From a paper:
Robo family receptors are type I transmembrane proteins that instruct neuronal wiring in various organisms, including worms, flies, mice, and humans, in addition to fulfilling diverse functions outside the nervous system. While Robo1 and Robo2 function as classical Slit receptors, the divergent family member Robo3 does not bind Slits and instead acts as a negative regulator of Robo1/2-mediated Slit repulsion. Further, a recently identified Robo3 ligand, NELL2, signals axon repulsion. NELL2 is a secreted glycoprotein containing a laminin G-like (LamG) domain, a coiled coil (CC) domain, and six epidermal growth factor-like (EGF) domains, flanked by five von Willebrand factor type C (VWC) domains.
NELL1 can bind Robo3, but it does not mediate strong commissural axon repulsion in vitro. Using SEC, we isolated a hNELL1 EGF1–3–hRobo3 FN1 complex. We crystallized and determined the structure of this complex at 1.8-Å resolution using molecular replacement (MR) with the NELL2–Robo3 model. NELL1 EGF2 also has a calcium ion bound at the conserved site observed for NELL2. The calcium ion is not directly located at the Robo3-binding site, but is still within 11 Å of the closest Robo3 atom. Second, our structural and biochemical analyses of the NELL1–Robo3 EGF1–3–FN1 complex demonstrate highly similar modes of receptor engagement by the EGF2 and EGF3 domains of the two NELL family members. First, NELL1 binds Robo3 with an affinity comparable with NELL2. Taken together, these results indicate that NELL1 and NELL2 display no significant biochemical differences in Robo3 recognition. Overall, our results indicate that NELL1 can signal through Robo3 as its receptor to induce commissural axon repulsion, albeit less effectively than NELL2. Despite these similarities, the guidance activity of NELL1 is at least one order of magnitude lower than NELL2’s.
Residue numbers in the entry:
A (entry chain A): 552 to 653
B (entry chain B): 390 to 518
Write the structure that this text describes.
Amino acid sequence: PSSPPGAPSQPVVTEITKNSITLTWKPNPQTGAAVTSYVIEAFSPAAGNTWRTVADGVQLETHTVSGLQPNTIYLFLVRAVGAWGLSEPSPVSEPVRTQDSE
Amino acid sequence: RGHNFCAEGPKCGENSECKNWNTKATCECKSGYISVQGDSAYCEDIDECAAKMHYCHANTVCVNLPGLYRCDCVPGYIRVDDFSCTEHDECGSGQHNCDENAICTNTVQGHSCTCKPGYVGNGTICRAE
Ligand SMILES: *[C@@H]1O[C@H](CO)[C@@H](O)[C@H](O)[C@H]1NC(C)=O
Ligand SMILES: [Ca+2]
């Protein structure tokens, strides 16, 4: 067996501020390669046409992405990391907007 | 502070970092490095591009780096994320029928259309909630 882990589940937004979003997800339930950490990627239609890697070496299944812009649409996906590399992407999260800065 | 165990003499190797704990020094490999033979005092670069590795994904050429790696696009391909590229920028060429209020994102297979927040639909059509 020399394969990466399975793809995690769709990340769920659990909390929103004007500069941060908190996400949670689960490892792939199918028996497979062991997960050693997670990678988080973010997309915004106002921030370029590629996904930006916003966190890596994430040990937990919950993490807060900070340094975001107010009143902005973000989408997120997670990859699982293992001995032989990265999983394919999880499903993309439902889009959310950060809170406004009033 | 505590005693500087690291300053007593050489301990950790070239790609390793000495840390003072309460009672002893310890060695940890630098980021992106791994023990050569089970001893974290002596580390070597992880080769993320070695055979059977899958750090880089579709339509990329893996480039190994000291402590890192990079996934370059196959010539002619356009980036989706750090790990994958795609043949065409379908979103930027009009090769899509996304709703006016749907977000277009390139994928390895083509593109997706996602209704923006507050709207419902399958991305080809979106209606306010
Ligand atoms: C979205 O719905 C329309 C009709 O409501 C349909 O013609 C189109 O194929 C659908 N697109 C997807 C991706 O399901
Ligand atoms: Ca490397």
